[PDB]
Amino acid sequence: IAEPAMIAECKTRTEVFEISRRLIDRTNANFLVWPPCVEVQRCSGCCNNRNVQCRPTQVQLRPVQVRKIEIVRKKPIFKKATVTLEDHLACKCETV
Amino acid sequence: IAEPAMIAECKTRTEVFEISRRLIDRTNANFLVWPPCVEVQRCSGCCNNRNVQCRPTQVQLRPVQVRKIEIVRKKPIFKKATVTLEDHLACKCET
């Protein structure tokens, strides 16, 4: 079978971030959000040198509008809501 | 000033899988692995319809060779070792 393993390099990679209840309202979170999750960029990957974690050099903040759908003990309510996404744009292997 | 959110669609996306101790040896976890992690494909993303999770239609197994470095008490030993990677190649929203 086998073939030779390639290290996951330290770079920015598309990930899926779920938009949680706590991010808009903790108080008895009896409501929903659309969309329920968005793509983001994060650093991930391993480092060649010993004792260097993969970490972000440059993070971009990106606010985005969603909808909050409150089950108002009976009837849907559609409010707009903004959430701020933290995108990584570059990575470096940096010391512990 | 905000802009309009785009749903993360149900598709295959490059992810980073860490190669753990238990995958080669639970009994003695006094050793290391190179590389420490590899890229894989997995399904991720949300579904448009109600009560449909994003899940894989086709998974590919892919065996890969790494090195196990045993601290044999004071002295390194380099053994080759194969690990099997599970790659997703297509996704569907399923109940």
């Epitope: 060649n48 | 190179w34 470095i69 002295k75």
Partner: antibody, heavy 116, light 108 residues
Framework: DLQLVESGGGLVKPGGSLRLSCAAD????????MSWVRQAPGKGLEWVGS????????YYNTKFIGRFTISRDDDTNTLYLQMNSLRAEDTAVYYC?????????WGQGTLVTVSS | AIQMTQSPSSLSASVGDRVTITCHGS??????LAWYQQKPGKAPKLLIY???EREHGVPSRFSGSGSHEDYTLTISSLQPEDFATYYC?????????FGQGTKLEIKR
């Protein structure tokens, strides 16, 4: 497989001095002995020397004991060969290699040409 | 040092032939021997190590044997892509020592 890349070679006047470096992808480098091996144009392979895991020890081929120093940087995953009082004899491709008795990983090599 | 004596210095062999290359040491080696193939221009590739162990990804036809002083690489069914120069290497005692090499030509 494991990567190794030698550099530091080229053209050098006789009597001169030169440092070769050999760089390795990956921290595995810190966990292995490392040898240098040379080979003159159209001739056989010749062990140059090795260095132990932690730096503990160095080992050399007699022909070379006076002239060459093997040094190792466990942070950069780099292996180094210091070469002094060079002569035509030393015109060779110089290999980096992973010493475990039996050298399972090789650089491509770096050509040293000794000539004025 | 221990002197490695490979034989023969050079040879031609037709496609399909069985071929043997022999390496002889000045002392008893106990399988602290390995075999390399090396194409023109390129680094050596490890074929056999510990006298008889094949390396992952080395074709079935390459075969290691020997004990004590006397060791053998055997290429069973010679393939045109096997043209190379082959070396043995002792590693029972420092300094490491190699053979003078065997330059293998394919004959046709």
């Amino acid at each position: 497989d494991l990567q190794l890349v030698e550099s530091g070679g080229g053209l050098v006047k006789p009597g001169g001095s030169l440092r070769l470096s050999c760089a390795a992808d990956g921290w595995w480098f810190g966990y292995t002995d490392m040898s240098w091996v040379r080979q003159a144009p159209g001739k056989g392979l010749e062990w140059v020397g090795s260095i132990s895991y932690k730096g503990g020890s160095t080992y050399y081929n007699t022909k070379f004991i006076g002239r060459f120093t093997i040094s190792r940087d466990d942070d950069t995953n780099t292996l180094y060969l210091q070469m002094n009082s060079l002569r035509a004899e030393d015109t060779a491709v110089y290999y980096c290699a992973r010493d475990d008795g039996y050298f399972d990983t090789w650089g491509q090599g770096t050509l040293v040409t000794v000539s004025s | 040092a221990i002197q490695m004596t490979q034989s023969p210095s050079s040879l031609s062999a037709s496609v399909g032939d069985r071929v043997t290359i022999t390496c002889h040491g000045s002392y008893w080696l106990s399988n602290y021997l390995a075999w390399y193939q090396q194409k023109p221009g390129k680094a050596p590739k490890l074929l056999i190590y510990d006298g008889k162990e094949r390396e992952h990804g080395v074709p079935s036809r390459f075969s290691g044997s020997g004990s004590h002083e006397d060791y053998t690489l055997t290429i069973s069914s010679l393939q045109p892509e096997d043209f190379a120069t082959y070396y043995c290497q002792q590693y029972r005692y420092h300094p490491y020592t190699f053979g003078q090499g065997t330059k293998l030509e394919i004959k046709r």
